[PDB]
C-alpha cells in the first residue's frame, strides 16, 4: 500500500558485468546478462551482442538504485552458447569516452521500500517518472510513466491476487507522486541556477523496516537531486536532515507544515501492517532462504603465480559476506565484485586474490549468509 507523499519542494562510471544465469554448457539453453551497476545519471545505452550483431528481443529490468542513489539495470536475453559464438555487451555512458565492450569470457529483518525516479526531459515531453516498490531484495510492483496505460502493475507471483481496490488506490498515488515529483524538478532548477537544456534527476525513497518484533524499527524518507543526498528523515520520525544549503530552505518548509506527522502515522502504522501481510501473502518467496552453492576455480597467469577465485551462486537474500584469508584475512590486495542479480530472483558473486603457486592449500574463502546455518570455509583442491 503506497503512501501519498503530497509535499513539493555527481556522475558514477558504470560497472559492466556480462555473465550467464547458469554455468555455460555448449548447446544448452542459457541466459546471458549484462548487469550494469553503480552508474549515474540514468541515461545509458546498453545492447547485448552476438558475434558483432546486435541481439533483438532482449529483456531488461525496471530502473532502481542502491543506497548511494547509483542506478543499476539487468539486460538479459535467452540464448544458447557454443564454441564459435562470442558475446559482448556494448555499454555507453557519459563518463566513458568510447562505448565499453565486455566480452563474455566464460571464466568470468524485513523492509518494504518504494523507490521513485523522475528524470526531466526538457524537450522530450513530460518527465520520465518510473517508480518501483520492493520488499527486502524482491520486487513486487512497478509503475512506468511511459507505459501505454500507466497503471500500478504487479511484478510478483503473490501480489496479483490483490483486488481492484488495491490497484486503483496505488495507481492514484503514483499518478499523484509523479505530478508531485514533476513540480519538484521544476523548482530545483530555480533553487540552483540551471539551464533548461539539461536533464536532471530527483530520486526519492521511503519505507518501513520491521524487526522480528513486528513493530517499526526505522522509518525512511530520503531525497536526492542529481545523485547526491538532498534531505532525509531522521530515525526520530520528527525532524529532518538537510545535506546542503538548498536542502535547508526546504527543510524549514516541511517542519512548519508538519509533513513528518503523516509520514510517522503511515510508517508506524499502515506501512508495517501491510509489510506483515505481504510477508503473509508472499511467505513462499520473501521468507525463503537458499544457501549459496560454492565452488573455487584457479586459472594461472604464470607458471608460479595464479589468481584464485571463490564463487557463490544462487543464494537469496542478497546480502552476503565473502572474503579471502591466508591460513585463516586479506581485506586489501583483494578484488571483490558487486553482487550480481541472476535474473530469477537469486544472486551471484565471486572474490579473487593473487597467490604464488605454492602453499595454495593454506588459503581459504569463508562464506557467511543469512540462509546459511553454520559458517563455511573452502579452498581449491583439484
Amino acid at each position, epitope marked *: 500500500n503506497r*503512501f*501519498l*507523499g*503530497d*509535499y*513539493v519542494v555527481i556522475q558514477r562510471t558504470p560497472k559492466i558485468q556480462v555473465y550467464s544465469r547458469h554455468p555455460a554448457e555448449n548447446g544448452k539453453s542459457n541466459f546471458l546478462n549484462c548487469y550494469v551497476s553503480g552508474f549515474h545519471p540514468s541515461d545509458i545505452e546498453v545492447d547485448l551482442l552476438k558475434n558483432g550483431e546486435r541481439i533483438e528481443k532482449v529483456e531488461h529490468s525496471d530502473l532502481s538504485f542502491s543506497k548511494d542513489w547509483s542506478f543499476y539495470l539487468l539486460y538479459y536475453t535467452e540464448f544458447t552458447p557454443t564454441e564459435k559464438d562470442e558475446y559482448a555487451c556494448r555499454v555507453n555512458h557519459v563518463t566513458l569516452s568510447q562505448p565499453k565492450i565486455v566480452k563474455w569470457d566464460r571464466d568470468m529483518s524485513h523492509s518494504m521500500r518504494y523507490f521513485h525516479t523522475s528524470v526531466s526531459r526538457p524537450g522530450r515531453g*513530460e518527465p520520465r517518472f518510473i517508480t518501483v516498490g520492493y520488499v527486502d531484495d524482491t520486487q513486487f510492483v512497478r509503475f512506468d*510513466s511511459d507505459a501505454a496505460s*500507466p497503471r500500478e502493475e504487479p511484478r510478483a507471483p503473490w501480489i496479483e491476487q490483490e483486488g481492484p*481496490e488495491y490497484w*486503483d*488506490r496505488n495507481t*492514484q*498515488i503514483c*499518478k*499523484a507522486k*509523479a*505530478q508531485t515529483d*514533476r*513540480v519538484g524538478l521544476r523548482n530545483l532548477r530555480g533553487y540552483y541556477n540551471q539551464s533548461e537544456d539539461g536533464s536532471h534527476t530527483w530520486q526519492t525513497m521511503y519505507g518501513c523496516d520491521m524487526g522480528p518484533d513486528g513493530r517499526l524499527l526505522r522509518g525512511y524518507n530520503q531525497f536526492a537531486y542529481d545523485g547526491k543526498d538532498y534531505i532525509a528523515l531522521n530515525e526520530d520520525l520528527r525532524s529532518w536532515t538537510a545535506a546542503d544549503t538548498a536542502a535547508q530552505i526546504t527543510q524549514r518548509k516541511w517542519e512548519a507544515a508538519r*509533513v513528518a506527522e*503523516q509520514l510517522r502515522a*503511515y510508517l508506524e502504522g499502515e506501512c508495517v501492517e501491510w509489510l506483515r501481510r505481504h510477508l503473509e501473502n508472499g511467505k513462499e518467496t520473501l521468507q525463503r532462504a537458499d544457501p549459496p552453492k560454492t565452488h573455487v576455480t584457479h586459472h594461472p597467469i604464470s607458471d608460479h603465480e595464479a589468481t584464485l577465485r571463490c564463487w557463490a551462486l544462487g543464494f537469496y537474500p542478497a546480502e552476503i559476506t565473502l572474503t579471502w584469508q591466508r591460513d585463516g584475512d586479506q581485506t586489501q590486495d583483494t578484488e571483490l565484485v558487486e553482487t550480481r542479480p541472476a535474473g530469477d530472483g537469486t544472486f551471484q558473486k565471486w572474490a579473487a586474490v593473487v597467490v604464488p603457486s605454492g602453499q595454495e592449500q593454506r588459503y581459504t574463502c569463508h562464506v557467511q549468509h543469512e540462509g546459511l546455518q553454520e559458517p563455511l570455509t573452502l579452498r581449491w583442491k583439484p
Partner: antibody, heavy 121, light 109 residues
Framework: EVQLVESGGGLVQPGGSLRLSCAAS????????IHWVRQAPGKGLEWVAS????????YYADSVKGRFTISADTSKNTAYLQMNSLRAEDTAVYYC??????????????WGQGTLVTVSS | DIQMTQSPSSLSASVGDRVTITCRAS??????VAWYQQKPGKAPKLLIY???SLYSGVPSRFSGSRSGTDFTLTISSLQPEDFATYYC??????????FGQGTKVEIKR
C-alpha cells in the same frame, strides 16, 4: 449514482464560525481528494481548500490559510470546511468537488450543487 | 503563482458558428489543463481534462488544443444548451489549483 450533497449554508455574522457538510453518495471520501471551490457569486471560481485522499494532507489557499479547517469523515462519507473569523469578502457559494488523477494532469469531475454562505451585519 | 488567463472574457456568437476560447498560463504548465462548463445557478462540469481529451459523455462538438503556454477550447458547432461559462484550470501545481477569470458564451440571434 455518484453525487455530492452540500449543506450548512446560511448567514453567519462577521467573525462567526460555520461547518459546511458535503455528503458523498455511492463513493467513499476515504479514497478521493475532496476540494472546495467558492464563487463570489457573480465572479470567477476560487480554489479554497483541499484534503488529500489517504494521507490527509490538508492544503488551503493563501487567504484562508489557518482560518479554515477542512476534514472528511469516512463513517459518514462527509466532508467539512470549518470556517472561522468570517470576513466581508468570504460571502460566496462553496462547491465541494471530487478529483480524478490522470498520468500527467488532474481535474474535478463530480461536484455538488453548492451551499451559499452569507456574511453580513 | 500560475495566474491563468482566459481571453476573451465574454463572446457572443450566432448558433452554428465556431467558438474559440484561449486560456494562457503565466508559466509552462506542460499538458495539464482542463476546461469546465457551468450554467448560471448550477454546478460546473468537466469537458476537457488532459489538455485536449474530451470527458466521457461530453458531446463531440467540444475540442481542445495545446500550444506552448497557450491553450484553446473549440466548440465545433454552437448549440442552444451550451450557453454557460467556461473556466480553464491548471493541475500542474496543486496548492493553489488556479482557475481562469472565466468566459461568457452567448448566442447571437
Amino acid at each position: 449514482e455518484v453525487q455530492l450533497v452540500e449543506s450548512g449554508g446560511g448567514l453567519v455574522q462577521p467573525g462567526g464560525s460555520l461547518r459546511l457538510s458535503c455528503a458523498a453518495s455511492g463513493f467513499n471520501v476515504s479514497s478521493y481528494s475532496i476540494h472546495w471551490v467558492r464563487q463570489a457569486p457573480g465572479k470567477g471560481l476560487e480554489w479554497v481548500a483541499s484534503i488529500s485522499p489517504y494521507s490527509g494532507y490538508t492544503y488551503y489557499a493563501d487567504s484562508v490559510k489557518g482560518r479554515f479547517t477542512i476534514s472528511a469523515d469516512t463513517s459518514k462519507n462527509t466532508a467539512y470546511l470549518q470556517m472561522n473569523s468570517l470576513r466581508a469578502e468570504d460571502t460566496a457559494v462553496y462547491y465541494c468537488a471530487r478529483l480524478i488523477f490522470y498520468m500527467w494532469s488532474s481535474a474535478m469531475d463530480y461536484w455538488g450543487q453548492g451551499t451559499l454562505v452569507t456574511v453580513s451585519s | 503563482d500560475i495566474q491563468m488567463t482566459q481571453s476573451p472574457s465574454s463572446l457572443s456568437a450566432s448558433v452554428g458558428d465556431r467558438v474559440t476560447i484561449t486560456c494562457r498560463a503565466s508559466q509552462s504548465v506542460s499538458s495539464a489543463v482542463a476546461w469546465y462548463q457551468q450554467k448560471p445557478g448550477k454546478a460546473p462540469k468537466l469537458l476537457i481534462y488532459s489538455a485536449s481529451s474530451l470527458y466521457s459523455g461530453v458531446p463531440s462538438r467540444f475540442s481542445g488544443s495545446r500550444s506552448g503556454t497557450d491553450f484553446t477550447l473549440t466548440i465545433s458547432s454552437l448549440q442552444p444548451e451550451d450557453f454557460a461559462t467556461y473556466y480553464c484550470q491548471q493541475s500542474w501545481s496543486a496548492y493553489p489549483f488556479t482557475f481562469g477569470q472565466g468566459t461568457k458564451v452567448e448566442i447571437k440571434r
